[PDB]
């Protein structure tokens, strides 16, 4: 039905320190050769309440993509802590992977991410200002939230 079918996304290097780059091994199948490019993005949700704090970590144009199976590791630098509101830094946030074809988003894969301290004192008495050098990022990889939108593939 859809020219591009995403078969699987594997979260690599997880858990890891907050500052480590994100690494996702994506596998997708192309039913027919694609005339245009696929644009992949990784978006970090800095704040659940405000859109302005979403950070596009990386965007990649892959194309043209011939028919068959494609597998690639999408890597993106960790978010800029200078744009993460303090109240949202520690605890659960979301990381999204999106793909568009001809500007139309056809898949959105989201993971809940748990940012937490690893030292007992910090876990019991967290600092007023979040210490990103002491946070451990744990992408909850066992439960991805997926949405597939039916777009125009011509």
């Amino acid at each position: 039905m859809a020219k591009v079918q995403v078969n699987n996304v594997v979260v690599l290097d997880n858990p890891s320190p907050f500052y480590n780059p994100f690494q996702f091994e994506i596998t997708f199948e192309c039913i027919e050769d694609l005339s245009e490019d696929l644009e992949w993005k990784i978006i970090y949700v800095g704040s659940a309440e405000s859109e302005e704090y979403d950070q596009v970590l990386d965007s990649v144009l892959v194309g043209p993509v011939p028919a068959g199976r494609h597998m690639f590791v999408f890597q993106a630098d960790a978010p800029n802590p200078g744009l993460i509101p303090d109240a949202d830094a520690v605890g659960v946030t979301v990381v999204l992977i999106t793909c568009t074809y001809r500007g139309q988003e056809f898949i959105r894969v989201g993971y809940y991410v748990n940012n937490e301290y690893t030292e007992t004192e910090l876990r019991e008495n967290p600092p007023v200002k979040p210490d990103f050098s002491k946070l451990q990022r744990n992408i909850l990889a066992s439960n991805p939230r997926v949405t597939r939108f039916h777009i125009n593939w011509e």
């Binding site: 949700v45 659940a48 309440e49 859109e51 979301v94 999204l96 988003e105 959105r108 989201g110 939230r145 997926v146 949405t147 939108f149």
Partner: peptide, 10 residues
Amino acid sequence: EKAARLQXXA
């Protein structure tokens, strides 16, 4: 309902 904003991602 903290993630009600993200309801275009289950």
